[PDB]
Design a protein around this ligand. Sequence first.
Ligand code: SRM
Ligand code: SF4
Ligand SMILES: [Mg+2]
Ligand SMILES: [Mg+2]
Length: 564
Amino acid sequence: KRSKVEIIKEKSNFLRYPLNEELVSEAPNINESAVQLIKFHGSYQQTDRDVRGQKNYSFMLRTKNPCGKVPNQLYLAMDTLADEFGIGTLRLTTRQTFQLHGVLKKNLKTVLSTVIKNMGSTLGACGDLNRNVLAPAAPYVKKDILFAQQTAENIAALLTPQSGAYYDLWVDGEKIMEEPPEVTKARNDNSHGTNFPDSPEPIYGTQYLPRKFKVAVTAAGDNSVDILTNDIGVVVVSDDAGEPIGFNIYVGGGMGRTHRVETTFPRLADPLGYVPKEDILYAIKAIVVTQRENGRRDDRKYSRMKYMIDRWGIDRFRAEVEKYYGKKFESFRPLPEWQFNSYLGWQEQGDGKLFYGVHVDNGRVGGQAKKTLREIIEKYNLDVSITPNQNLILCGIDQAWREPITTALAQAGLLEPKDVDPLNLTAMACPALPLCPLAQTEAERGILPILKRIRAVFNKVGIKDSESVVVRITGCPNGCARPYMAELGFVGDGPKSYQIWLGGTPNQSTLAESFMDKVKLDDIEKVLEPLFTYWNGTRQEGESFGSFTNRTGFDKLKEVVNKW
Ligand code: SRM
Ligand code: SF4
Ligand SMILES: [Mg+2]
Ligand SMILES: [Mg+2]
């Protein structure tokens, strides 16, 4: 027994048909087969859910940018495309990519080929494939940060579709201007029966993966990447002099779940083991292959790797992976405590240049903010990078540029961290309505008024305005803003209501739990005021809301809410 998507992939000639014929039909949309295929090419057909009556079809596009790195030429091309063919905005994402919403079917090939001819790609941004690979977004020249970044690039390249469908459709097969040889040799290796050596996809095969697959790379300590949520987390381990020697690996995280279906759940990734640095790409493929061959393909709700690991347990999974790796994992090595880093504000690269992280609420770049960011990036010929908290880092800045860049940013309303509510600095919301077809309610368009209401509750209770909690909001339980790691998570569960989740911590090292269902938007103060009063009244010195939640436990918190 096999899902509808499996058959679509099977009969597509490696992601070509009938997408190829649908792209040139006169209709404003494309058929269901083509709807599923185009995801693999980094585009999503959407309809605007605000405009009553009619189906206004449009296409969202998502880029592929390992480590969040965006060359100058790409940023300029994307900025112009958003205005010419989109709806005037770029959307920075929780996986360090751009989305561009609103593109009409007839302009889609113009847009994607422009991306392609300007040092970018959308290949594999969606689909049953490896998604954008995360890495530390800060452009530090420190050796282990550079090594984390190189590794994410290499992993992304390894797991890039090889069929040629992408260039066939978007640029009529022409050639666009080299991967390290370690990548090529790893991809080619079949000493342990990992590959399909005669297939146009030696790793993916005809069927690709059972579902999206997510990888995050970082250096010890830096949890900007929210590593525990990914299919694979990879951590650089270095000797005492800061020279990288290998990687710790984690497996089997995921956020996605469905309301009222308790066999679906978020899950933290398990520590799997350590490998020496030369082995990383072999170990990554082994893991991918184990999911390829064993993840469920009958029911897509249960297809992500977190489920096979939940069913088999981590030891049986390890053993299976070790058959494709051809050797044993070493013991996972100790790591320091995780820390969240925003990379915001003025900092040093380590090579004489500065970087500046720009706070962007929800990653939505538009209006004057967009115009000013483009002027700066273009005038100073800056490369940039996207952070997993939907923010933008301006790289490679000369000391003499710091003042005029600062002045321009401030003039457009783009404030430095010290002038932003600390709630906003760590908050995230998904796009949800109006273009998300799975949204049950608002997230991006509701979060800002929610934050002000939280700050007003703090004020009322007597909490200082420099105190904060991590607030994440989604419009549905898919978890695109990783709400299940929040200190205070709001997960859409009706048209005007949120399920509230507590128990995440400031460094994203813990999984939250479901605290109350169907809290109506108007009622959130009834829940938040007692919680925050009790935190303020009985927290230990400097104890975060999340740690306090986990120490106190849900029975006592519910009692406090119920007696309010
Ligand atoms: C833009 C972005 C959210 C954001 O505010 O930044 C996003 C937006 C959507 N995600 Fe997501 N997801 C984004 C990262 C995530 C993450 C976070 C992460 O990867 O760290 C998760 C949770 C981790 C996980 O995958 O478990 C997430 C879990 C989902 C799911 C649930 C997946 C599952 O296996 O259960 C879906 C729906 C699906 O795949 O069926 C989904 C599907 C969607 C769709 C494409 C809706 C759809 O299927 O048509 C989104 C479009 C909204 C729009 O109108 O633009 N998205 N999605 C995400 C940043 C993504 C990127 O690749 O560049
Ligand atoms: S979490 Fe739900 S509502 Fe939000 S973007 Fe993802 S799918 Fe859409
Ligand atoms: Mg997909
Ligand atoms: Mg942000």
